[PDB]
Symmetry: C2
Subunit: 182 residues, 2 copies
């Protein structure tokens, strides 16, 4: 019944819900230990292993389902209303997920497609410290690469590794030049 | 007359042609010395300073105009046909621009808009070694950041520097979390 119910809940959860749930459970289950988990039921049972989910303890489950906005599953399988979960989670100490994970997840919620792509681009820029706006051309990029000492008369490795994933003609130009350096 | 002709040629060249010409002249004029050059005439006179451009020496000029495919200016102002320039530049030793700069410039020629954006992205990936692609979501990115030890409970600098350039609501979530940890 109970485990059967858990399977029932697990059946209605897709890949996105699985990823979100695994992220929200990082406070108890390490990220490397999550890769064997391929569905929601494995996660549920892993939670049972840490005694955070049993017939007498459905709190963390309800919290998880509430965070990912699966209120339908709460009503259907757990008989739980949104008002109850809110009233509970506002009460201090009753929250079992850290404010950090919650914060990151809410950020992930607020972000759209374009905002996500922009997030990747901006992150890459903040890591490499080489902001490549659409103002500069390929020549300026070459200059920046020579400045970074990653491009030169005898250093074409990165240029080739980039051009190979774009167009064979470019790589053919590079090789033509490189073989004329006999 | 001669200087008049040089001004005439310089007048017909736009910003793109200027950038290309300055790039093709890096073998004689350092990059840091090219920033004062705001038009083609300054570049021409700078070439005159290095005695690479005079009434009896229009070789490097014709070569430059040929490389950037301004054959119209060659015909109009220099009385030079494409066949002549090809036949001349094919003859060894007569070329004054290194094969390296020529190679890079031809690469810049063959690349279109989308190929350029792809070049920026791929370069960023090859530099930061953090290939993300459009396959993974924001949560996987967060995991990668924690793996990179650039994101944590007490390390929100980069997350904030990214989110600030995306949406104030995200930054408001971050600050809300950060101020509730009193």
């Amino acid at each position: 019944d109970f485990s059967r119910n858990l399977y029932d809940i697990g059946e209605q959860l897709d890949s996105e819900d699985l990823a979100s749930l695994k992220f929200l459970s990082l406070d108890y289950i390490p990220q490397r230990k999550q890769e064997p988990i391929k569905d929601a039921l494995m996660l549920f049972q892993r939670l049972q292993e840490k005694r955070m989910l049993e017939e007498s303890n459905l709190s963390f489950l309800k919290e998880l389902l509430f965070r990912i906005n699966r209120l339908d599953l709460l009503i259907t399988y757990l008989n739980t209303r949104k008002e109850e979960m809110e009233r509970e989670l506002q009460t201090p100490g009753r929250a079992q997920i850290s404010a950090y994970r919650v914060m990151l997840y809410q950020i992930s919620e607020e972000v759209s497609r374009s905002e996500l792509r922009s997030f990747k681009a901006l992150l890459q820029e903040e890591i490499s410290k080489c902001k490549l706006d659409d103002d500069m051309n390929l020549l300026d990029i070459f200059i920046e690469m020579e400045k970074r000492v990653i491009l030169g008369e005898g250093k074409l490795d990165i240029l080739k590794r980039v051009c190979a994933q774009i167009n064979k003609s470019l790589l053919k130009i590079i090789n033509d030049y490189e073989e004329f350096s006999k």
